[PDB]
Paper text:
To carry out the structural studies, we used a conventional “single-chain” construct design in which [name]-1 NS4A amino acids 21 to 34 were fused via a short GSGS linker to the N terminus of [name]-[name], yielding a full-length [name] protein in which the β-sheet of the protease domain is stabilized and activated by intercalation of the NS4A fragment. The resulting crystals diffracted to 2.23 Å, in space group P21 21 21, and there is one molecule in the asymmetric unit (ASU). The overall [name]-4A structure is composed of four globular domains arranged in a tetrahedral fashion, as observed previously for gt1b [name]-4A. However, there is a pronounced shift in the position of D2, which is caused by a 9.6° twist in the conserved β14/15 hairpin (amino acids 430 to 452). The twist in the β hairpin propagates into a displacement of D2, altering its position by about 8.7 Å relative to the location of D2 in gt1b structures. Most importantly, the displacement of D2 drives it closer to the protease domain, creating a more narrow, concave area of positively charged residues between D2 and the protease domain. This positive cleft would be expected to improve early, productive contacts with RNA and to confine it in a specific orientation, potentially contributing to the faster and stronger RNA binding by [name]. Similarly, the conserved RNA binding motifs IV (residues 365 to 372) and V (residues 411 to 419) also shift outward by 6.8 Å and 4.2 Å, respectively. Together, these structural differences expand the length of the RNA binding tunnel and would enable [name] to accommodate one more nucleotide than gt1b [name], potentially explaining the higher RNA affinity and processivity of the JFH1 variant. In contrast, the RNA binding tunnel in apo-[name]-4A is completely open, resulting in unobstructed access to the RNA binding cleft. The shifted position of D2 prevents the formation of H bonds between Arg393, Gly554, and Glu555 in [name]-4A and frees the cleft to form a known set of interactions with the backbone of single-stranded RNA.
Author numbering: -15 to -2, 1 to 181, 185 to 631
The structure:
Amino acid sequence: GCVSIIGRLHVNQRASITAYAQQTRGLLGAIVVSMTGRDRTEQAGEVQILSTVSQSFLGTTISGVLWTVYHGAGNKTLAGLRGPVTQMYSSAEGDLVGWPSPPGTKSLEPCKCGAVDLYLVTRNADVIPARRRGDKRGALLSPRPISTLKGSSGGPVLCPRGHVVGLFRAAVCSRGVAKSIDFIPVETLDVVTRSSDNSTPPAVPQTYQVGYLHAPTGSGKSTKVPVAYAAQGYKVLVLNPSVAATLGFGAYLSKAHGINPNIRTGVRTVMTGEAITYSTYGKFLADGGCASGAYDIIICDECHAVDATSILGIGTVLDQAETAGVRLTVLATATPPGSVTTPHPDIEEVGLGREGEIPFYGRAIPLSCIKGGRHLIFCHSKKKCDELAAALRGMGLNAVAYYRGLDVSIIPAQGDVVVVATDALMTGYTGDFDSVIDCNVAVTQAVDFSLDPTFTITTQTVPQDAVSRSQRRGRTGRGRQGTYRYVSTGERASGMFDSVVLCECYDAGAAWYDLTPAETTVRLRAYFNTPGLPVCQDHLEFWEAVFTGLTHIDAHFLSQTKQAGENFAYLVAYQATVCARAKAPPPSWDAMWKCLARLKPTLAGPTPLLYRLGPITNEVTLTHPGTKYIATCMQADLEVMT
Ligand SMILES: [Mg+2]
Ligand SMILES: [Mg+2]
Ligand SMILES: [Zn+2]
C-alpha cells in the first residue's frame, strides 16, 4: 500500500502559465513499486502524478514538501530510493498530506500577493482560469463538465506570477456542471507545519471541556476508569454502541468489583441508584439525550464507530452536554484516526502461509486449522461464502454460510462448525469462536451523485482499515484464548468517511427517533466541529433539504422496513408510499420491497423513481414531483471531491 509516481508535470512561466505533462510508468511498474515501496529512478518536475494502482491523482511540492490530498493518499507512505517514506504532515480535517519531496523535484513558491485571477493546472497539463471567491474557492470563467476535473485533486492553483495560491481538492457543481473550484489555501499548509499523548484519563476540569482517551480495549477504560471518576464523587455515564458490550460491563463491575451499576438498553433496563450508568447510544437517544443535572462525566466509548446511531449519539452529547451541566465529555477509543491495530490479550495473531488445502485470497487455509471446534471465516461477498462453505462441506466439515438475507438461527449454538460470513454477522450475531480467518477485504456503502435521475446508493470494495480489523478479530478470544489468521495487514484507522453516512444519519434520525432534519443537522454540526473524530464532506445542507421534502410517509411501511433492518429504512419506506399512492409497482421485486407484496396485483405502469437503492427491473418515469424536488436539490451548489 504505497503511493507511486507514474508521471510528472513541468510548470513554468511563459495566460502566462505553461504546463507540460509526461507519463513515465504503466500498471506493472506501479504495482511493483507500490508493493515493494521502492523507487530507484530519478525524479523531476514541480508536480507529480501519483497512483495507488486503482486510482490516480496529483501532488505539488512546495518548500521541499510534496503535498497532496488526504482523500486520495490517506495514511500511506510514498515509494522512495531506500524504501517507503512516511508522511511528515497529515490532516484529515484539512484534507491534506505531506511527504518529504523526492530529490530532483522542484518547489513552487507560495503566493503572498493576494491575486483574484487564479489558474488550475490539471493532470493533463491544461491551465483552467478562475476568479477568487472568498478564501478557499474560485469561480471558473467557463463552466465545464465535472468529469474533466476528476483525477486532478492535489494539483496547483496558481496566481498570474506562478506562485501557489492553493491545492485543488474539489469542484462545486450544479448537477454535473462544475461552476467553481475549491482548494486548500497555502496558509493552511503553514498552520499544519506546526503541531499527542492521550494515553491516560483526562482530569475533571472546573468548566466544561472535551477530553480524549486513546487506550487499548479491555485495558479498563470502560470499567476501571469510570470507577476512578466515581470514587472521586462524580456521577458517570458510559455509552457504547452494542447491547452486549453495555450489558457486559455492568456484569463485570458486579461480579468483580461488587458494584451494581445502572443499565439502560432497549432490551433490558435496571436502575439501582448507583453513580455509574451504562447505556447504548441508541437508548441514550430514545431517552431524549442529556437530562438536566444528571451526570458530571459522559464517556463516549468506541468513538471510532461511524454507524448512524453512534454518530448521532456522540453528536447529541457534544451539542447538549455543557448546557445540561456536564463537566467532562470523554471521547474514548482504542483506534483513533491514523492509528494501527495493536495485539490484544490472549489473541494469537498468525499470518496465513501459501501452503494448505483451501485457497484463500492469495494464501491458503490448512484443514488442520478448522477441523474440530468452532471457527469464523470472513468473506467479502455472498457468492464467495456459498462457494467456500460448499468446498468445506465436501471435505467433511460442518460449514454454513451467512450473509444479509438469511436468518442467524442458521448458525448452530454448539458443536463443531465453520461459519463463513460477511460483515453482516457483526450486527446480526453476538456469539464468538475459537478462531477468525480474515480476508482483510472490506465492502462499504457509498453514494454516487449519478443524475439518473438523482443519487445512487451503491458499494465499494476497499482494503480493510484498523477499525474493521479490530471488529472482526474481536469475534474470538472473548474471556479466553483465541486465534486470528489473516491475509494481510490492512490500512491505518480511516480519518474520513463517505457522504452516504450523513444520509444514513438523517434516515435513522427520522425513522427511529422522529428527529426533524433541522435537528439532525445541529447534532451533526457538533460532531463535525469537534476535533479528533472522523471527518466528512459538508453535505449537511444538501441532505437536510432532500429529507425535508420527503413528507407524509406511510407509517405501516416504515414499520416493516424497520423490522427488516434496512440500513435506509426511511428511503425505502418512502419509495414504497409514492408507488402505492401512484398505483405503481416498486423499481424491482427484491425483498427490499416486501411491504408492497399484497398490493402487487393492484399496481401497474412505470414506477416513479426518486433515487436508486438497487437494480431496476421495471419501467420507470422521472415524472413525480418527488423526483423533481430531489433533482432540484442537486442543482444547489454541491461540492464533489475530485
Ligand atoms: Mg475496559
Ligand atoms: Mg475501543
Ligand atoms: Zn502570487
